[PDB]
Amino acid sequence: YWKTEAQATAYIDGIHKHLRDAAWQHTITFGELRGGRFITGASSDGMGVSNGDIILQNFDETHTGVSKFGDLFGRITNLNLFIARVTDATYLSDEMKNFYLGEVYGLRAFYYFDLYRIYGGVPLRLTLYMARSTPKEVMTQIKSDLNKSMEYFGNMNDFDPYKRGKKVYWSKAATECLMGEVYLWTSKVTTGDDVANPADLTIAKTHLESVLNNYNLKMLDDFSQVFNAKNKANDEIIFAIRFLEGEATNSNGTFTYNVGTGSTKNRYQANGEVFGDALDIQNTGNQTYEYNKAVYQNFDDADTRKEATFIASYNKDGKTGELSLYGTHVRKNIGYVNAQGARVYCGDYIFYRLPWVYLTLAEIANMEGDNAAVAKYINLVRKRAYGNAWDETLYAYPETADFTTNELAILHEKDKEFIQEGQRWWDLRRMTLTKGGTPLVFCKEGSLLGDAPILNKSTEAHKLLWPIEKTMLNKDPALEQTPGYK
């Protein structure tokens, strides 16, 4: 139905902006909230927090977290349409056609992999009132799409071949990262009829090592520079969602405080000074998402990620003047203050960056038994974190044959490295207490405090997957409820 290069390229831009619009759901709703480290009730700043049912694992046919399969099928159908229209188009160069098709097959895998991890089986729309396909059928499609993505990208490793925006359009590296994520997952996790297959580890490994070796990627010396809105598309980043002042901004202000009406402003900073507007966010913020303060307290003070990620607010004892930790507030990726003095939340949403590749390879190493490589990759990330304070004697991970110690060390490094970057729920589903053993979501060792499992395996096994709404079930008789829910 199209006649020109301009139209195809416009549609590619549109595909990316719709992907931007799903970034909060991908990273925060799906990746973070069920991770066992958010508070509920009133935040430190005084406001009832959002999504409390997701956070509490309260899931059933009237508490579904998101509606309409996360509203992703509209996006998917635009990908299908692009593929149908462009596959035999004669108005694009072979190079641009193949680059675009690489992107669009990659992104169709991306969306379906979120749907598989959240729901298991879902309708397979590739070309309403369609039945859910089985998890195996969905994963077959995901993997077919990833292979087609690589086939189209071929040898084009360039991140920015048309100079439209480096690292903010999908790329060959991004597909390789996704393959690393997908094949590791299927190596370790059974969902319905899609049975864990250790043969997949080798494929994950090859693609992640390719990412390390073939794209000129490098970890930055300064953790904060990774996220800095004035240092975007830097050498550590593989693929990020672009937020741009005057076009689209994100909701990272909701992890802060409300200067207008909240209580944080009247508490204190670590130095004893009144908190006020310590982040320079004016009245742009609220505190409707907040990490349990143990997340902050888990960092050593010599770990630069601590104050890069968080600012703390304190109560001061009326008698003794002693400060006690009260709330924490996320300043990891809150953009900048513009020339007019307004806070703009245009921090990019990074989906893949290099330390993720390292900790993912660490997890593969743990599966192999390559204890030396587990330690290597953990220490690469730690050494960067501690900066000029790095001291192997205090902070280095010593190698060990104990699978559990290694798996937990990798989780706890991801827990520190990837605050607000959408990993922990996935890590809890995927990582296991022992080789071939119980998912960490069912073990007290996976919880923030170490005291009780996030899910009870004997009563809550069905809550690994998310339910769909009663109203949708009533309107669409093709659909069945996610397994095990009433």
Side-chain angles (χ1 to χ4, degrees), residues 2-127 129-318 320-474 476-486:
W2 289 313
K3 314 284 174 186
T4 71
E5 169 275 313
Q7 293 170 311
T9 296
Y11 204 92
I12 283 284
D13 287 4
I15 283 161
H16 285 79
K17 296 196 180 342
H18 279 139
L19 178 68
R20 174 200 64 209
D21 292 350
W24 179 271
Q25 178 170 261
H26 166 77
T27 291
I28 304 295
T29 316
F30 290 167
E32 288 283 330
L33 293 181
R34 292 188 73 175
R37 52 182 188 175
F38 278 92
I39 67 113
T40 61
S43 64
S44 293
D45 200 48
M47 180 54 201
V49 295
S50 299
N51 298 124
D53 288 317
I54 297 175
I55 291 159
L56 293 166
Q57 322 290 338
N58 291 344
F59 277 101
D60 57 40
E61 72 175 1
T62 55
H63 307 76
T64 70
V66 302
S67 303
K68 305 191 279 309
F69 287 105
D71 207 16
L72 301 179
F73 283 107
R75 283 154 174 101
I76 287 162
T77 55
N78 292 359
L79 303 184
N80 301 341
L81 187 57
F82 187 93
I83 290 173
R85 290 197 213 196
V86 166
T87 291
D88 300 320
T90 59
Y91 53 85
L92 300 174
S93 65
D94 296 354
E95 283 75 26
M96 180 175 288
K97 179 198 284 189
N98 287 343
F99 194 81
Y100 286 172
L101 288 171
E103 289 185 310
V104 169
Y105 280 98
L107 287 176
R108 192 164 69 179
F110 175 86
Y111 282 125
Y112 272 111
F113 182 49
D114 272 7
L115 290 173
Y116 173 97
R117 293 186 291 181
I118 294 290
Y119 296 106
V122 295
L124 273 177
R125 302 208 155 83
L126 304 173
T127 59
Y129 300 59
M130 188 180 321
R132 301 172 67 160
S133 289
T134 70
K136 171 70 161 175
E137 291 171 317
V138 173
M139 188 50 72
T140 294
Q141 183 61 38
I142 287 170
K143 286 175 175 175
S144 176
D145 286 343
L146 289 166
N147 286 340
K148 208 70 166 134
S149 179
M150 303 293 296
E151 185 183 325
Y152 279 113
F153 277 135
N155 285 307
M156 297 173 310
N157 284 27
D158 190 338
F159 286 103
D160 196 22
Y162 303 106
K163 305 301 176 257
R164 312 283 276 103
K166 184 188 189 182
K167 289 167 176 198
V168 297
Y169 287 84
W170 194 269
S171 63
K172 187 189 165 171
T175 289
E176 291 213 89
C177 284
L178 187 52
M179 297 179 79
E181 199 176 23
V182 166
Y183 283 84
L184 182 58
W185 180 287
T186 58
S187 295
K188 290 179 70 162
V189 189
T190 294
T191 307
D193 66 347
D194 198 34
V195 181
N197 184 5
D200 283 347
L201 286 166
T202 52
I203 293 169
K205 197 180 180 179
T206 293
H207 286 290
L208 293 155
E209 290 185 331
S210 182
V211 175
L212 293 187
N213 293 348
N214 297 317
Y215 298 92
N216 297 123
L217 293 154
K218 306 191 241 304
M219 202 173 37
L220 308 187
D221 285 342
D222 184 310
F223 185 78
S224 63
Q225 283 287 80
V226 169
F227 311 93
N228 177 347
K230 303 276 189 44
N231 188 35
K232 292 182 177 194
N234 60 70
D235 286 354
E236 186 165 319
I237 292 176
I238 286 102
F239 175 79
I241 296 298
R242 180 53 51 80
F243 284 101
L244 180 62
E245 183 175 0
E247 181 177 77
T249 57
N250 59 57
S251 295
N252 285 359
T254 65
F255 285 71
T256 67
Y257 51 93
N258 192 321
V259 166
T261 63
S263 53
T264 304
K265 56 169 180 289
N266 299 316
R267 297 201 176 88
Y268 302 86
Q269 312 187 51
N271 66 342
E273 182 178 353
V274 179
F275 191 98
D277 182 13
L279 295 186
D280 198 2
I281 63 165
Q282 312 90 48
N283 201 28
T284 64
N286 73 36
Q287 197 174 36
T288 50
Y289 296 86
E290 189 178 358
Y291 291 96
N292 185 291
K293 69 177 79 179
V295 171
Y296 181 77
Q297 296 172 316
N298 272 354
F299 292 95
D300 296 317
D301 287 332
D303 184 334
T304 63
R305 299 176 288 202
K306 187 174 186 157
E307 300 298 313
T309 304
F310 289 114
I311 190 172
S313 60
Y314 296 80
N315 258 343
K316 162 153 89 170
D317 189 286
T320 74
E322 175 192 353
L323 299 173
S324 60
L325 180 63
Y326 192 96
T328 62
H329 315 268
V330 178
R331 59 166 155 203
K332 191 169 173 169
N333 187 35
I334 57 157
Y336 56 60
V337 182
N338 69 17
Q340 297 70 42
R343 168 62 59 180
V344 181
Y345 297 104
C346 63
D348 280 0
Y349 259 50
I350 302 170
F351 285 2
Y352 300 111
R353 57 177 178 95
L354 204 62
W356 177 92
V357 176
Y358 297 155
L359 293 170
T360 309
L361 281 166
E363 184 171 335
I364 291 165
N366 200 26
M367 288 298 289
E368 291 167 333
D370 192 342
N371 303 313
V374 171
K376 177 183 73 188
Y377 283 122
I378 291 168
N379 288 319
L380 274 169
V381 178
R382 293 190 181 182
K383 173 184 185 177
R384 195 273 288 279
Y386 286 85
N388 294 329
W390 175 241
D391 177 344
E392 294 172 42
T393 77
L394 299 186
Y395 305 133
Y397 183 73
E399 92 170 66
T400 178
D402 189 73
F403 182 98
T404 299
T405 304
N406 285 329
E407 199 87 334
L408 299 170
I410 291 162
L411 168 72
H412 290 155
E413 207 59 39
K414 286 195 76 176
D415 282 350
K416 289 174 191 188
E417 185 64 21
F418 297 116
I419 289 175
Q420 207 184 65
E421 283 183 276
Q423 302 297 300
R424 192 167 218 263
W425 173 239
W426 304 138
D427 295 341
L428 294 166
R429 288 278 316 283
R430 191 192 60 257
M431 303 185 86
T432 59
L433 190 71
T434 54
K435 186 170 174 282
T438 312
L440 285 184
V441 64
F442 298 131
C443 305
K444 63 179 187 309
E445 295 89 344
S447 71
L448 182 58
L449 295 189
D451 56 341
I454 292 168
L455 301 176
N456 179 322
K457 190 169 191 302
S458 71
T459 61
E460 287 177 313
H462 69 284
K463 294 186 182 179
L464 296 174
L465 307 176
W466 299 42
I468 63 169
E469 311 85 281
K470 188 187 186 74
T471 44
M472 254 208 321
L473 286 179
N474 294 350
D476 188 342
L479 295 178
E480 284 174 358
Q481 188 56 262
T482 306
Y485 285 91
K486 300 310 182 58

